[PDB]
Curated annotation (Swiss-Prot):
Gene it is expressed from: glcB
Keywords: Cytoplasm, Glyoxylate bypass, Magnesium, Metal-binding, Oxidation, Transferase, Tricarboxylic acid cycle
Protein name: Malate synthase G
Cofactor(s) listed: Mg(2+); Mn(2+)
Source species taxonomy: Bacteria, Bacillati, Actinomycetota, Actinomycetes, Mycobacteriales
Family, similarity comment: Belongs to the malate synthase family. GlcB subfamily.
One of the record's GO molecular function terms: malate synthase activity
Known role: Involved in the glycolate utilization. Catalyzes the condensation and subsequent hydrolysis of acetyl-coenzyme A (acetyl-CoA) and glyoxylate to form malate and CoA.
One Gene Ontology biological process: coenzyme A metabolic process
């Protein structure tokens, strides 16, 4: 119709044009040979993809019956073994992934995640490798507004001084002088290769002069001083003529931190992309980032420095990029077969994002070691991991890339991956560069998998349940036992409260203390603040100290988060229903009506949260669970949705083109989607929301196409 026929494939025209005209040129790959490659890879791997998806349904159906036909933990576990859910743990091994960049193998630090469909955000992200500590401290609630230090339309000097002080204190804790404090420093010099600091009554150096990494300008009167601690860089910009530098005892203008060492450009949960036009926009942005010519305002270039002993060197000025493809579930009409059946989206993302990423290896650049970094979400168990690897192998042939060029980041966010984590890693032993954990998806799967067992604890309660604490520790243990320390990242989840930076600075330190190589932040600002934690915590030492430990048993992992009988008062029930209905509606309306997958969404208490699509999975699965066991009724669910809808409406009053859901609820496609997600929730595969979401978004767009 409006498609290009290649073999058994009917490629959407926008897609076909985009690959040939934009993606392919530069890659030395023959267009027709590429498309034929696509035709064959799709046909060859599609049935295998389907077999894995069906296998999920079989397991879940068996688990459903088992619960209904009853809690004997020993029998439950033996059952999961019998049905091939819980597979035998392989002997110890060590990953062999080679050609990995240092930012992944060695450097511990923040990792940004940004919706690929947003060129400006994506630009900021790639440039967030370096960010200003002053701007971050002054701009957020880390420095309390309190007494005369409040922000205004004018720069407030009382506040800047607190910022300066905080930064001086940080320098004391990070790169300690052999004597005295940074707060008293009056100047900085470089005599005989060693950084000398000017104190009022004397002069000292770094207690460990190894932390001196270089400088700019002349050794006598430098324009900046480069420091290193825990593999992370710290830059003191010295400029006595600047506004802040003028009033500073040492002429200091700013302190710059190496912040977002890596960034994940996201095709999955932070992006709304339900057809061929959407995917191209995303692919196009991914192309521009990889050719290094995206702009709206360009991509930063490397940074120049002078070695402590005179010579010249350089550091990368951009955030090393991953891409997150979609998982194994969804199809997309960007390609169909002759029968009209949509082609598997994950298979498409491997080919296209992989094709595109070729530009990142030639000059502008990304991986200096020659690798492409794909993060794969929502896999269920080790066979699904081996499938992803086999897919990568094939795509590499179509692209003419050396084998194992396309590295994998295994996200641990499904229960069948959690309890088989060592086997999952081993299936990717020569490609794996990353594992991580998070709250939303994983708890959604937790609730779905045990849907029939009984009513679950409230969402808040989940964060402190035995299963999830065991899962957090188990993740770290498995990676370290597999040799990740020095070879691959071990990550932990997102800080979602974008305006609550004091809290983040206070609490998020627990992640590197738990041995996390990296963890997720929602903004460049956040990345800068979070970098503090890796200065205070020596993650390599922590990881070294954790080795050999088994801090989580299979029994703990399998402890279902069931509510003890009569746990809640009727007002607690309503509070939770309301809370969850608000979460659905707040995220759904922006998603369906505007194709926005990630934004600052006020929760029921007007706190700004930055969650991806998975917030929909947990909240819908919880209410569906509570529906299934009669904690609440259908009258309850609808009443709550009707109450929260105008509240969401009001929270979007500051939106130039928002559309009310109230009072005409059934004419709101957004409202109907929220309602469907909940009432149809128990029947969704593993509780996945995309089937309902994609359809409703496509419906809204067709309604709007008039
Ligand atoms: O895990 C989360 O909550 C999360 C992921 C992403 C990606 C962009 S915003 C965001 N929140
Ligand atoms: Mg997820
Ligand atoms: Mg140390």
């Amino acid at each position: 119709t409006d498609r290009v026929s290649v073999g058994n494939l009917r490629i959407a025209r926008v897609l076909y044009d985009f690959v040939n005209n934009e993606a392919l040129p530069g890659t030395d790959i023959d267009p027709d040979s590429f498309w034929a490659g696509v035709d064959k890879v799709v046909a060859d791997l599609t049935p295998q993809n389907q077999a894995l998806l069906n296998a999920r349904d079989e397991l879940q159906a068996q688990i459903d019956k088992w619960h209904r036909r009853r809690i004997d933990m020993d029998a439950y576990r033996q059952f999961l073994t019998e049905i091939g859910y819980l597979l035998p743990e392989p002997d110890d091994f060590t990953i062999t992934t080679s050609g990995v960049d240092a930012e992944i193998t060695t450097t511990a630090g923040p990792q940004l995640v940004v919706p690929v469909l947003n060129a400006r955000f994506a630009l900021n992200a790639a440039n967030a490798r370096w960010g200003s500590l002053y701007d971050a401290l002054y701009g957020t609630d880390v420095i309390p507004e309190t007494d005369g230090a409040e922000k205004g339309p004018t720069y407030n000097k009382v506040r800047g001084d607190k910022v300066i002080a905080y930064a001086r204190k940080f320098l004391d804790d990070s790169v300690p002088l052999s004597s005295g404090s940074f707060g008293d420093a009056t100047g900085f010099t470089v005599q005989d290769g060693q950084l000398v600091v000017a104190l009022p009554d004397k002069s000292t150096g770094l207690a460990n002069p190894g932390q001196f990494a270089g400088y700019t300008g002349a050794a006598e009167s430098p324009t900046s001083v480069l420091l290193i601690n825990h593999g992370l860089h710290i830059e003191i910009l010295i400029d006595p003529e600047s506004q802040v530098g003028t009033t500073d005892r040492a002429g200091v203008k700013d302190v710059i931190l190496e912040s977002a060492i890596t960034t994940i450009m996201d095709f999955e949960d932070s992006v709304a992309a339900v057809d061929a036009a959407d995917k191209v926009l995303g692919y196009r942005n991914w192309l521009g980032l990889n050719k290094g010519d995206l702009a709206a305002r360009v991509l930063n270039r490397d940074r120049n420095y002078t070695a402590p002993g005179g010579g010249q060197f350089t550091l990368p000025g951009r955030s090393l990029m991953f891409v997150r493809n979609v998982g194994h579930l969804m199809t997309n009409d960007a390609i169909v077969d002759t029968d009209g059946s949509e082609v598997f989206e994950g298979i498409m993302d491997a080919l296209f994002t992989g094709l595109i990423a070729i530009h990142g290896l030639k000059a502008l650049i990304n991986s200096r070691t020659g690798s492409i970094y794909i993060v794969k979400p929502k896999m269920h168990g080790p066979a699904e991991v081996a499938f992803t690897c086999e897919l990568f192998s094939r795509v590499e042939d179509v692209l003419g890339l050396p084998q194992n060029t396309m590295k994998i980041g295994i996200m641990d966010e499904e229960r069948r991956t959690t309890v088989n984590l060592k086997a999952c890693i081993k299936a990717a032993a020569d490609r794996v560069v990353f594992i991580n954990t998070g709250f939303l998806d994983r708890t959604g799967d937790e609730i779905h998998t045990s849907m029939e067992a009984g009513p679950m604890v409230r969402k808040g309660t989940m964060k402190s349940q035995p299963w999830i604490l065991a899962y957090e520790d188990h993740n770290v243990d498995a990676g370290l036992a597999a040799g990740f320390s020095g070879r691959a990242q071990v990550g932990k989840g997102m800080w979602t409260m974008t305006e609550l930076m004091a809290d983040m600075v206070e609490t998020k330190i627990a992640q590197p203390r738990a041995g996390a190589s990296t963890a997720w932040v929602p903004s460049p600002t956040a990345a800068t603040l979070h970098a503090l934690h890796y200065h205070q915590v020596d993650v390599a030492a922590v990881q070294q100290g954790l080795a050999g430990k088994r801090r989580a048993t299979i029994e703990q992992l399998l402890t279902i988060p069931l509510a003890k009988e009569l746990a809640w008062a009727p007002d607690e029930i309503r509070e939770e229903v309301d809370n969850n209905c608000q979460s659905i509606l707040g995220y759904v309306v922006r998603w369906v009506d505007q194709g926005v997958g990630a934004s600052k969404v006020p929760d029921i208490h007007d706190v700004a949260l930055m969650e991806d699509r998975a917030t929909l999975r947990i909240s819908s699965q919880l209410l569906a669970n509570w529906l299934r066991h009669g904690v609440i009724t259908s009258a309850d669910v609808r009443a709550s949705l009707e109450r929260m809808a105008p509240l969401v409406d009001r929270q979007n009053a500051g939106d130039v083109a928002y559309r009310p859901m109230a009072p005409n609820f059934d004419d709101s496609i957004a409202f109907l989607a929220a309602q469907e997600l909940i009432l149809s929730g128990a029947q969704q595969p593993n509780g996945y929301t995309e089937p309902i979401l994609h359809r409703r978004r496509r419906e809204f767009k067709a309604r709007a196409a008039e």
